[PDB]
Amino acid sequence: AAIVPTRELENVFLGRCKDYEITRYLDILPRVRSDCSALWKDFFKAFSFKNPCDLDLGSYKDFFTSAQQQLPKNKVMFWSGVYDEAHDYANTGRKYITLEDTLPGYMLNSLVWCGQRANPGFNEKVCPDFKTCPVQARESFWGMASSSYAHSAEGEVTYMVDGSNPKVPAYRPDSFFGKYELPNLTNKVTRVKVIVLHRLGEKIIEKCGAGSLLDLEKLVKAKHFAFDCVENPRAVLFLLCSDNPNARECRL
Amino acid sequence: AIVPTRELENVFLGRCKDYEITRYLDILPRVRSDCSALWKDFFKAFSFKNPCDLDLGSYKDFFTSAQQQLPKNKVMFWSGVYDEAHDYANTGRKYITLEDTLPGYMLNSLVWCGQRANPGFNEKVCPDFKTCPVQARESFWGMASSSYAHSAEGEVTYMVDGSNPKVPAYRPDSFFGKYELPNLTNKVTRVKVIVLHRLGEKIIEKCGAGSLLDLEKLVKAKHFAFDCVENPRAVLFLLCSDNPNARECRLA
Ligand SMILES: Nc1c2nc(Br)n3c2nc[n+]1[C@@H]1O[C@H](COP(=O)(O)OP(=O)(O)OC[C@H]2O[C@@H]3[C@H](O)[C@@H]2O)[C@@H](O)[C@H]1O
Ligand SMILES: Nc1ncnc2c1nc(Br)n2[C@@H]1O[C@H](COP(=O)(O)OP(=O)(O)OC[C@H]2OC[C@H](O)[C@@H]2O)[C@@H](O)[C@H]1O
């Protein structure tokens, strides 16, 4: 009902950066060139000392240029509407990289903050519902983070979707994938591998080769990428079956 | 040779702060000591001592101060099976592990030791864990285990490797046998054993036989209820996700 910013933004941000730098993803992802306090300054100039709605997609540009890590070939995952499953399956960078394993992704994941014109330059009480803010403002941070990450992808990329939502198609132009990732994929990308997630016990809404997925197949091949698509592949199925052993789809 | 974690203080501080503000919020409670005080407690336990001058009480003030009350029926202990038990407990949402609690999360996989000379810790090198006496070598994780075991309430779970020919499911000298089981209080009402049979390996340890029967008697003598299961479905699926063609991952 009121939307409360994260406490001690700097401290938390600097805390994760430092943790990350020294101890996270060591063999999986490169360290980045800039120190944590340099990263803080690029992050903070993007919103401090302006209205909370006073942002666009240029705003965090310098932050993302500094934070961008080269990303391992064939490992990049995108996801829509399946945060829990896509992450369980990407298994913390072992099998796939998500945006949330990346430095910027990790530092800001789940955090809430916004600017205010008066000192200390950010609000510590309340943030607006970002439905009140123009889209470029609401989406300045994660939108650009998605774009920067997709622009760094190389080789085969993977896309996990929900193909069980009757209200939300598997693929949409209007998702973060559809707005910021698919169209920023460069000619170092060779293939989009789609994994459709049919939630256990639920009506199958979207199918490979049909509907929004066919719309995507087309978008993909039109970008010159190879394309494939699987519906609950054994590896993913088992993972769903772990949280719902009895589900008919998991029968021994 | 073994390399200490760099910037141990900032790494500790950074994790402590990230934890306090953002981690396990609806799952585990905050401690009242602030980060810096906890650092003071942690540092005093091993600083300005021989790297091997450590006993089961060196870190007592750290833990007292860092110990969190642990939610009923969620406590898991583990042996021989870090990845599976951790994947299974699923970041404190199915069960809690020590690694989810403040102290285990701040220190997981870090490497530090004291020296008598200024600045009181060693940044270059720490002794191989085997030159050092058991009580000093187990001085940090051993007391973490006792403290955490001491805090468990209701039904506790113990996940074990049933396929190690060299290492019993239960051993009077594991961390479980030495630090956890004996620190279980009257707050505890049951010990639930989960025996993990690795996919495509000889089944070695069985429920009601061998070390598991030894455990069963020790547990009952302590007036706790006892069950034990081998590869329950939820866990089996978890293993099959990682190796789906396994004979045992067979489906309809
Ligand atoms: N929390 C930890 C822990 N954290 C780390 Br980084 N280690 C740990 N070992 C035990 N425990 C606690 O003690 C119990 C398991 O101890 P066990 O005697 O069965 O030991 P094994 O499982 O065979 O090996 C664990 C290895 O990882 C390291 C150790 O250096 C060690 O080399 C758990 O319930 C847990 O709460
Ligand atoms: N732990 C968590 N931490 C943070 N957020 C969590 C969360 N858990 C959930 Br559950 N969400 C939210 O689920 C909402 C629905 O968005 P969506 O339809 O699933 O996917 P897209 O629009 O395609 O954006 C995704 C693409 O851009 C980023 C990444 O590269 C990915 O590929 C999101 O707004 C999340 O905030």
Q: Does B82 touch chain A (CB under 8 A)?
A: no
Measured in Å, residue B82 CA sits from the centre of ligand 1 at: 8
- How is residue B215 written in tokens? 């455990």
Please state the atom number of ligand 2 nearest to the C-alpha of residue A87.
1
Residue type, A211: G
Report which protein residue has its CA nearest ligand 2's atom 3: A110
Q: What is the DSSP letter of A190?
A: E
B177: DSSP letter = I
CB contact under 8 A, B244 and A250: no
User: This structure's resolution (angstroms)?
Assistant: 2.4
Contact yes or no for B103/B141 (Cβ under 8 A): no
Say what angle helices B8-22 and A9-23 make with each other, to 10 degrees.
130
Tell me the residue type at A126. V
All structural domains of chain A, each given as residue ranges with its CATH number in brackets, are: 1-69+102-153 (1.20.82.10), 70-101+154-252 (3.40.50.720)
Taking the CA of residue A182 as centre, how many other CA atoms within 13 Å lie in the half-sphere pointing to its CB? 27
Interface membership of B190 toward A (CB under 8 Å):
no
Query: Cα separation of A107 and A69, whole Å?
Result: 13
Our CA-based measurement puts residue A9 at a distance from the nearest CA of chain B, in whole angstroms, of: 9
Give the amino acid at B237: F
Distance B134 CA to ligand 1 centre (A): 14
Separation between Cα atoms, residue B106 and residue B104, nearest integer Å: 6
Check B237 against A242: CB less than 8 A apart: yes
- The residues of A annotated as belonging to the active site are 100, 176, 181
B82 in Cβ contact with B65 (< 8 Å): no
Query: How far, in Å, is the centroid of ligand 1 from the Cα of B12?
Result: 20
Residue A69 DSSP class: P
Task: Please tell me what DSSP assigns to residue A5.
Answer: P
What residues in A contact B10, CB-CB < 8 Å? 18, 22
CA-CA distance, B95 to B74, in Å (whole number)? 5
Q: Which of B241, B242, B247 best probes binding to A when mutated, by most A CB atoms within 10 angstroms?
A: B241
Tell me if residue A195 falls in helix, strand or coil: strand
Cβ contact B228:B192 at 8 Å: yes
Q: Is the CB of A25 under 6 A from ligand 2?
A: no
Contact: B237, A251; criterion CB under 8 Å: no
Query: Whose alpha carbon is nearest atom 16 of ligand 2?
Result: A81
Nearest by Cα to B18 from A40, A12, A111: A12
